[PDB]
Structure formats: C-alpha cells, structure tokens
UniProtKB/Swiss-Prot annotation:
Has potential for application in biological recycling of plastic waste products. One of its GO terms (molecular function) is cutinase activity. SUPFAM superfamilies: alpha/beta-Hydrolases. GO terms for cellular component: extracellular region; periplasmic space. Its main location: secreted. This is Cutinase 1. Catalyzes the hydrolysis of cutin, a polyester that forms the structure of plant cuticle. Shows esterase activity towards p-nitrophenol-linked aliphatic esters (pNP-aliphatic esters). Capable of degrading the plastic poly(ethylene terephthalate) (PET), the most abundant polyester plastic in the world. Capable of degrading the bioplastic poly(lactic acid) (PLLA). Disulfide bonds join 241-259. The gene is cut1. Its EC number is 3.1.1.74, 3.1.1.101. InterPro entries: AB_hydrolase_fold, FrsA_esterase, PET_hydrolase/cutinase-like. Belongs to the AB hydrolase superfamily.
C-alpha cells in the first residue's frame, strides 16, 4: 500500500470544510531567526507522524496574513505548512522563489524538534499568491525535485515555463485585473510541457484577491493537488480527473488538465 496516505477516504464535504481531519498547532518564526526570508508561521498536525511540507508566499505589499487561512487549512489535512513573510513586502517574484526555498529549509533544519520530526524532507511543495505565484513557478524551474507547485493568481514577467516538470496546478481568477489570466496564468499554463502533470483552474466570479479570503474552491483543489502529488495519494485523483472540466457556475469558469497523471 502507499505509506504516505494520511487521513480518511475523502469526500467533497471533507475537502470543502473549514478544516480537515487533523488538529493543528502553530510555531511562530521570528524575523530574526528566519534565515533568508522574513519569518512566518508554521502550521503542523498535532498527531505525531511524518508529512509532506509546503511553503506559501504572499505577493507585493502582502504579509503572511493574506495567506494564513490557506496554510492552516492545508496543514489540517496532513501537511507541515509555513506561511512566510518576505525580506521586504516589495520583493520581486524571483526573490520570492529564493525565500520560499529558504523557508522549506528552515522547516526541515531550523524549526523546533516538534516541527522537524513531523517532516518527510523528501516530499516538498510550494505555493504563492500573485508575485508569490511567480516565485512558485521560478522555484519549480530551479527545483524539479519538488513534488508539487501551486501558483495562485500568479504574476510574472516571464511567460515561458517550458522547462518545468514539477506537477503544477495554476489557479486563475476570471475577473483578475492585476495579474489577468490572459497575460499571466494562461500563458504560464500553456508554456508548461504537455508531458508533465499540470492543471489550470479558473475561478468564476473571482477577483485578484480571491486567494486572500477563505475560499472553498481554492482550499478543495489545493488540498487535492497536494494529496495527489506530495503524498502520491490516488484517493484524490477522482477530484482532479476529469476535474470540474465544463465549468461550474459561480465556482469554476474553466478547468484544463493533462489527466491521466503519471504516478510516481
Ligand atoms: Cl503581487
Ligand atoms: Cl482584480
Ligand atoms: Cl484520466
Ligand atoms: Mg512572527
Ligand atoms: Mg466568470
């Protein structure tokens, strides 16, 4: 059987709920102790086991407060998750890529033993909002050893991500006027290889700031993607293939994917 499975068999309601089946704890990461990023919060399951680990970045002028709900929710499904602050709130995407990587390595090596003992350091993922989503793409290109990448309403001036092989779910917002899907999220998705595991999910009725307030669709598909690719958990394939692929009014404007997904 797959040794990385955690939690009960999933349902729609379980994934749409405010929290998953794991109670969570928090560890503050001081700015002074945070090496190579601005600090942040680590959310982790109280139950002693090993889990995959995830770092999440905000965007320009943003703080961890704009992503905290999502890091806590993902951790409650069985992940160790750090929501970062950046060195300055104005850092550019390629700098945020570095900082996401530094945050992964902080969790693995420099957090409390309570946190470090809960991490499988071989199973890592990154996510981020807007310029933090651009940073997610850049880090994925640098680190094909990541198990998953989830850019949220991403922003980057580089439109060509044709080397990336990390399983990548891009979440766009139909009404985004700041990182429009026409010039950011869709070109990024279209440039990813056809031969990798990838998906594009466009939220319906959503602005650029949809990732900054609790969202049941972002939570559902972020957790299903992380389960499928960080944990190789094929109990979550059913949510992603074929996925919400004809739209779902007020939920999903469009969904594209390279289903079926190769299994590691
Ligand atoms: Cl941004
Ligand atoms: Cl917007
Ligand atoms: Cl399929
Ligand atoms: Mg702090
Ligand atoms: Mg729409």
């Amino acid at each position: 059987a797959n040794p990385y499975e955690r939690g009960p068999n999933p349902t729609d309601a379980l994934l749409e709920a405010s929290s998953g089946p794991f109670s969570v704890s928090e560890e503050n990461v001081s700015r002074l102790s945070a090496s190579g990023f601005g600090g942040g919060t680590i959310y982790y399951p109280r139950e002693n086991n090993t889990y995959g680990a995830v770092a999440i970045s905000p965007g320009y002028t943003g703080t961890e407060a704009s992503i905290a709900w999502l890091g806590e929710r993902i951790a409650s499904h069985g992940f160790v998750v750090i929501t970062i602050d950046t060195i300055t709130t104005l850092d550019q995407p390629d700098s945020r890529a570095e900082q996401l990587n530094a945050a992964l390595n902080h969790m693995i090596n420099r957090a409390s033993s309570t946190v470090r003992s809960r991490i499988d350091s071989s199973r890592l993922a990154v996510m981020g909002h807007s310029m933090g989503g651009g940073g997610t793409l850049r880090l994925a290109s640098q680190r094909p050893d990541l198990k998953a990448a989830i850019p949220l309403t991403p922003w980057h001036l580089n439109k060509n991500w044709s080397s990336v092989t990390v399983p990548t779910l891009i979440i766009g917002a139909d009404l985004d006027t700041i990182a429009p899907v026409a010039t950011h999220a869709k070109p990024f998705y279209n440039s990813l290889p056809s031969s990798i595991s990838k998906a594009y999910l466009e939220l319906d009725g959503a602005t650029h700031f949809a990732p900054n307030i609790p969202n049941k669709i972002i939570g559902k598909y972020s957790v299903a993607w992380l389960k499928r690719f960080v944990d190789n958990d094929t109990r979550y394939t059913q949510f992603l293939c074929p996925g919400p692929r004809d739209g779902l009014f007020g939920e999903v404007e469009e969904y594209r994917s390279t289903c079926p997904f190769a299994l590691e």
